[PDB]
Design a protein around this motif. Structure first.
Motif, PDB file in Angstrom:
ATOM      1  N   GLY A  45      -9.055  -0.140   3.558  1.00 43.88           N
ATOM      2  CA  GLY A  45     -10.193   0.312   4.347  1.00 43.88           C
ATOM      3  C   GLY A  45     -11.478   0.266   3.537  1.00 43.88           C
ATOM      4  O   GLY A  45     -12.432   0.980   3.921  1.00 43.88           O
ATOM      5  N   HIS A 105       4.799   4.406  10.127  1.00 49.85           N
ATOM      6  CA  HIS A 105       3.663   5.178   9.666  1.00 49.85           C
ATOM      7  C   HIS A 105       3.987   6.652   9.863  1.00 49.85           C
ATOM      8  O   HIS A 105       4.099   7.118  11.003  1.00 49.85           O
ATOM      9  CB  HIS A 105       2.389   4.786  10.421  1.00 49.85           C
ATOM     10  N   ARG A 140     -10.931   8.406  -0.732  1.00 54.53           N
ATOM     11  CA  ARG A 140      -9.576   8.055  -0.358  1.00 54.53           C
ATOM     12  C   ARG A 140      -8.741   7.830  -1.616  1.00 54.53           C
ATOM     13  O   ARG A 140      -9.211   7.197  -2.569  1.00 54.53           O
ATOM     14  CB  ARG A 140      -9.589   6.821   0.532  1.00 54.53           C
ATOM     15  N   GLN A 161      -0.514   2.895  12.325  1.00 52.35           N
ATOM     16  CA  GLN A 161      -1.348   1.777  11.901  1.00 52.35           C
ATOM     17  C   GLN A 161      -0.494   0.706  11.230  1.00 52.35           C
ATOM     18  O   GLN A 161      -1.039  -0.275  10.738  1.00 52.35           O
ATOM     19  CB  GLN A 161      -2.423   2.254  10.916  1.00 52.35           C
ATOM     20  N   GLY A 195     -12.323   9.591   5.781  1.00 54.06           N
ATOM     21  CA  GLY A 195     -11.804   9.506   7.130  1.00 54.06           C
ATOM     22  C   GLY A 195     -10.781  10.594   7.444  1.00 54.06           C
ATOM     23  O   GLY A 195      -9.899  10.368   8.264  1.00 54.06           O
ATOM     24  N   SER A 234      -8.933  13.301   9.285  1.00 49.28           N
ATOM     25  CA  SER A 234      -8.932  13.647  10.704  1.00 49.28           C
ATOM     26  C   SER A 234      -8.500  15.093  10.973  1.00 49.28           C
ATOM     27  O   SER A 234      -8.870  15.637  12.003  1.00 49.28           O
ATOM     28  CB  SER A 234      -8.038  12.699  11.476  1.00 49.28           C
ATOM     29  N   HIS A 271      -0.252  10.075   4.115  1.00 51.29           N
ATOM     30  CA  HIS A 271       0.168   8.956   4.948  1.00 51.29           C
ATOM     31  C   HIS A 271       1.106   8.034   4.173  1.00 51.29           C
ATOM     32  O   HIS A 271       0.889   7.752   2.992  1.00 51.29           O
ATOM     33  CB  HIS A 271      -1.029   8.102   5.382  1.00 51.29           C
ATOM     34  N   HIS A 278     -12.559   2.849   5.914  1.00 54.35           N
ATOM     35  CA  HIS A 278     -12.222   2.507   7.287  1.00 54.35           C
ATOM     36  C   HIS A 278     -10.726   2.712   7.574  1.00 54.35           C
ATOM     37  O   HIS A 278      -9.893   2.881   6.673  1.00 54.35           O
ATOM     38  CB  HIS A 278     -12.693   1.069   7.590  1.00 54.35           C
ATOM     39  N   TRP A 279     -10.407   2.664   8.865  1.00 56.95           N
ATOM     40  CA  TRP A 279      -9.053   2.730   9.379  1.00 56.95           C
ATOM     41  C   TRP A 279      -8.739   1.493  10.215  1.00 56.95           C
ATOM     42  O   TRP A 279      -9.560   1.132  11.040  1.00 56.95           O
ATOM     43  CB  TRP A 279      -8.917   4.007  10.208  1.00 56.95           C
ATOM     44  N   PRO A 280      -7.590   0.802  10.043  1.00 56.85           N
ATOM     45  CA  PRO A 280      -6.549   1.254   9.143  1.00 56.85           C
ATOM     46  C   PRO A 280      -6.867   1.038   7.659  1.00 56.85           C
ATOM     47  O   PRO A 280      -7.791   0.281   7.315  1.00 56.85           O
ATOM     48  CB  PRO A 280      -5.372   0.385   9.555  1.00 56.85           C
ATOM     49  N   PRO A 281      -6.054   1.627   6.743  1.00 55.56           N
ATOM     50  CA  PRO A 281      -6.295   1.533   5.303  1.00 55.56           C
ATOM     51  C   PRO A 281      -5.651   0.300   4.712  1.00 55.56           C
ATOM     52  O   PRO A 281      -4.722   0.404   3.907  1.00 55.56           O
ATOM     53  CB  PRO A 281      -5.678   2.810   4.732  1.00 55.56           C
ATOM     54  N   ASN A 321      -6.578  11.100   2.582  1.00 55.06           N
ATOM     55  CA  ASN A 321      -7.970  11.002   2.979  1.00 55.06           C
ATOM     56  C   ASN A 321      -8.653  12.314   2.675  1.00 55.06           C
ATOM     57  O   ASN A 321      -8.129  13.364   3.014  1.00 55.06           O
ATOM     58  CB  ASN A 321      -8.076  10.675   4.468  1.00 55.06           C
TER      59      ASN A 321
END
Ligand SMILES: O=C(NO)c1ccc(-c2nc3ccccc3c3ccccc23)cc1
Lengths: 115, 111
Positions: free
Chosen positions: A115, A40, B80, A36, A94, A96, A103, B107-110, A88
């Motif tokens: 976000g 990353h 988050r 992203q 979010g 996954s 991250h 949301h993504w991206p952060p 996350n």
């Protein structure tokens, strides 16, 4: 099969390939497959903790190690202008994959809100 | 010194959620979600890029405190956690801080 059978557990055991940046006895840093940002990557514990919400009190130093390794890796990759670290949790967060992962994103201006 | 030093020293108001001997958690003054708080060390680490190896436990403690406060604030659908470094990271205050945001879909991206 230690490290769990999430995809990240498989990566830890080298059953599934990944682009590894750094590895020690406690953690693994590797590039994210859906980046992203220009850089990353992910830092994960080798010990399977499914999510930050269930981390044990004595997982403190391990979670700190994720951040220290993250910041060292960011420097070694030349993220001189900075970066964003993200964990996350759950559905609203979010998340996954249910194996804790930090991250680390950089090589571009990151925006607010995150976000 | 930073505004966060002022907050730790109790020189300016903040809505404190939790305190111990080594960290402080408080609501963010410009929240970006229904729940948006910070967890900061009382030790003045200017940015995560300059944290020391010996600081590992402390940094981990910020996240454990963050996750306990999140549960206590009723963030049961998730949240988050964010640390910003430098200009590209959007770090707004040169005192290490862990953001914790929830109460809405992130949301993504952060950013
Ligand atoms: O379905 C998903 N989210 O909703 C999801 C969850 C994990 C991976 C995924 N991530 C990675 C991150 C770094 C390196 C390798 C991988 C990887 C390699 C093979 C197969 C899947 C993955 C991809 C997609």
């Amino acid at each position: 099969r230690p490290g769990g059978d999430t995809i990240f557990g498989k990566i830890i055991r080298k059953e599934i390939p990944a682009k590894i940046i750094f590895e020690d006895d406690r953690c693994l840093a590797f590039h994210d497959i859906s980046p992203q940002a220009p850089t990353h990557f992910l830092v994960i514990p080798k010990k399977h903790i499914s999510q930050i919400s269930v981390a044990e009190d004595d997982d403190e130093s391990l979670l700190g190690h994720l951040m220290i390794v993250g910041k060292k890796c960011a420097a070694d990759l030349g993220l001189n202008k900075g970066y964003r670290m993200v964990v996350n949790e759950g559905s609203d967060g979010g998340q996954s994959v249910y194996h804790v992962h930090l991250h680390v994103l950089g090589g571009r201006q990151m925006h607010w809100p995150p976000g």
